[PDB]
Write an enzyme that holds these catalytic residues in place. Structure first.
Site, PDB file in Angstrom:
ATOM      1  N   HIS B  45       0.812  -1.231   0.000  1.00 43.98           N
ATOM      2  CA  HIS B  45       0.000   0.000   0.000  1.00 43.98           C
ATOM      3  C   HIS B  45       0.845   1.282   0.000  1.00 43.98           C
ATOM      4  CE1 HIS B  45      -4.091  -1.733   0.467  1.00 43.98           C
ATOM      5  NE2 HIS B  45      -3.372  -2.793   0.840  1.00 43.98           N
ATOM      6  N   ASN B 146      -7.240  -4.468  -5.430  1.00 48.77           N
ATOM      7  CA  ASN B 146      -8.406  -3.611  -5.234  1.00 48.77           C
ATOM      8  C   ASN B 146      -8.004  -2.209  -4.739  1.00 48.77           C
ATOM      9  OD1 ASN B 146     -10.565  -2.749  -2.816  1.00 48.77           O
ATOM     10  ND2 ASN B 146     -11.543  -3.298  -4.748  1.00 48.77           N
ATOM     11  N   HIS B 147      -8.746  -1.186  -5.183  1.00 46.65           N
ATOM     12  CA  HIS B 147      -8.517   0.207  -4.801  1.00 46.65           C
ATOM     13  C   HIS B 147      -9.859   0.922  -4.552  1.00 46.65           C
ATOM     14  CE1 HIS B 147      -4.224   0.080  -5.310  1.00 46.65           C
ATOM     15  NE2 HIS B 147      -4.356  -0.623  -6.414  1.00 46.65           N
TER      16      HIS B 147
HETATM   17 MN   LIG Z   1      -6.277  -4.591   0.315  1.00 47.23          MN
END
Ligand SMILES: [Mn+2]
Ligand SMILES: [Mn+2]
EC number: 3.1.-.-
Lengths: 406, 424
Positions: B45, B146-147
């Protein structure tokens, strides 16, 4: 205040601190990658033309690429714009070709990395951007990948230190300098307050071909909102002038300073200004000791742009001064048709082809009519007139501009 | 719901599986010989908490650590379960920092012992190390994650691929018809068949498996000679029976499953006795929320593959900020006089629990470093501390910010140290 600008010469201070023989440089500026991205007709123009510049450099076997800034149109380019720029730089600049340029001076020269095989090093300064702007630029990202050499950094607008990149090929020596874009008024003030320090190598003083790269206004309405040519130190032999979009690739010789100024222009039109009409070019500058030879190269991928100035009272086909609403239309429509034929002929000229069924057809051109309608003539709604050329012109808006003589 | 979750375990091997026709140095750069060593991680991230004055550089330092361990430990490759970046559109700093770490840790003269048998434009090099102009010492393989950021056809992962620093695999052009093709890699007698499925909306992927719209391709050559590894980025569990990927759905020919998306570190792995595979959920390299799942100390791992066998080595991350959470039920405490003006007593107990959590966090940090608290050694960073307080039963509370302000310069989360709630 404008009179004062001509009198002021050699501003700032100069300090002194520490074709095998022909340096070939592909010179260009302002590709504005990402400009007009969302336009249905013009969306891929900036990507294709930026690729062309790198493609010519590879095909023509140049030693390096020098850009006058504005690789990207925006401060924050889209993911497509960044991807396309990186793809073109990787495919056109990497290779087994040896770099004949010797350095005498992540951040270090790219073509000097042992993990990256750079065939043609790209050198660029930071340019001006109008979208909303931390301490990280899109140019820093291009540098970090090892694909572009970001030079001429301006950390402080107050005290600017201009240091050279020293490059040698055989007997020819090049001292490459750069000043990244600074707000014009700010820079002007820095030269006046003697806050610009140019560093020259003590050794081989008179031996280095001195090249300066700038990204500023060459002229302005206010006497402090541009960089005067006389301000630039006379030890320079060549000045690459970025920011200004008009192609003036032939160059201008300053007899007092003793240095040539080359304004290559953008590789894309960012407005329908008279300056954007001049056909786009890049150039090959061949430095050989002290003299050089500049070769102008016409860009094949740039969309043609024709602008015409019309005086209605001079049109013998129109009757004055009656309801000539019909006369003005017929005549104006024929002038757009004439401008399209001129644009198509300009495109085929750039390609070296003729209009035949076997050959590729030209792209939709940009057309602008500046029409003087004085005393008197019936005008149309500019948008309504522009709707007539829906699949003939690239610009759905601003085909015509009506005006009265001041 | 209960009947539908039950039916999920009954179904297995969903989709379709068919066969398709197909030191040592294999890198083309031009200027344990039978053991494939893979550094496994997920969800760094990069860019998360960027604007936080204390936590701003956490994601950059920890993503660098993962690449640093890979280089120091001399692994053959890096395999990630997605979410290299926190956002769809990462900041210029986040992109610069990721590229800088990848370039410094993955490029080098080290030979790549992995032979590419088959990769089942392109003007660019799909595989990194096969590019004759880039000197890739350690190839990075990753799927798209995923975002939650607004997505304005080009991803930040496509940008990492185009630079030649990351190998983007397991693309999913169409959600309806998903074709899962392998990357075939050989090192000595060891044969690895690497598969990936980039993140698909959980409900959409669940439906594709049920409608048999997921096709798995297997190499005809060496049929029962490959070590089958699948990389996913999905929910491992959910409240709704259609909003996650059930383990039973995944074809039993697989030997190992790397599970991305899930942040909790469960690096030890879980063995599915029916499907006969080990599922490894490595977890994120940064806490994205102050959830109970984020408390488990962060790790990466070295997956050693010899033939059809594997050995996984758990590696503790040294750069991750310690995070201690405590669940406090005020009715389960004593001597807390309830249903009286008990503010002083409630506060005195809670303050001591924060102090206890700080001491636990510091001890957890020194453990990860292998050091002791002395003047010559580096001191721990400010830890993340969270108290989830149930105040049902008659208990006076304090404003969460004023409570957090009691520990100024002692905790990394100086705003939300406590959360007061009533049991639903
Ligand atoms: Mn995630
Ligand atoms: Mn400009």
């Amino acid at each position: 205040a404008f009179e004062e600008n001509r009198r002021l010469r050699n501003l700032g201070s100069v300090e002194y601190i520490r074709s095998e023989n022909t340096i070939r440089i592909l010179i260009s500026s302002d590709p504005h990658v990402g400009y007009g991205e969302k336009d249905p007709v013009r969306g891929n123009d900036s990507f294709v033309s930026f690729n062309e510049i790198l493609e010519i450099a590879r095909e023509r076997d140049v030693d390096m690429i020098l850009l006058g800034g504005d690789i990207f149109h925006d401060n924050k380019p889209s993911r497509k714009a960044l991807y396309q720029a990186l793809r073109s730089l990787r495919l056109n600049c990497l290779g087994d070709k040896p770099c004949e340029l010797e350095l005498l001076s992540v951040c270090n020269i790219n073509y000097l990395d042992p993990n990256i095989n750079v065939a043609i090093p790209v050198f660029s300064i930071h340019g001006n951007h109008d979208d909303p702007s931390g301490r990280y630029s899109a140019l820093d990202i291009l540098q970090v990948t090892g694909l572009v050499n970001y030079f001429g950094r301006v950390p402080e607008n107050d005290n600017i230190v201009v240091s050279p990149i020293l490059l040698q090929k055989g007997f020819t020596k090049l001292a490459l300098y750069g000043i990244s874009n600074v707000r014009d008024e700010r820079l002007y003030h820095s030269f006046r307050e003697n806050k610009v320090k140019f560093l020259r190598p003590d050794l081989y003083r008179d031996e280095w071909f001195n090249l300066l790269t700038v990204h500023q206004n060459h002229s302005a309405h206010t006497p402090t909102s541009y960089l005067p040519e006389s301000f630039i130190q006379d030890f320079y032999d060549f000045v690459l002038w970025g920011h200004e979009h008009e192609c003036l690739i032939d160059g201008s010789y300053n007899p007092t300073q003793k240095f040539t100024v080359v304004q290559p222009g953008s590789t894309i039109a960012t407005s329908l200004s008279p300056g954007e009409t001049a056909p786009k070019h890049c150039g090959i500058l061949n430095i050989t000791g002290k003299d050089f030879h500049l070769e102008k190269i016409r860009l094949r991928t740039v969309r043609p742009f024709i602008m015409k100035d019309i005086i209605l009272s001079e049109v013998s086909s129109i009757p004055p001064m009656v309801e000539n609403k019909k006369e003005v239309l017929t005549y104006l429509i024929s002038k757009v048709e004439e401008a399209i034929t001129e644009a198509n002929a300009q495109w085929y000229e750039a390609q070296g082809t003729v209009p035949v069924v076997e050959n590729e057809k030209p792209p939709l051109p940009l057309i602008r009519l500046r029409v003087d309608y004085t005393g008197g003539y019936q005008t149309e709604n500019p948008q309504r007139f522009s709707n007539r050329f829906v699949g003939r012109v690239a610009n759905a808006t601003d085909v015509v501009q009506f005006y009265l003589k001041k």
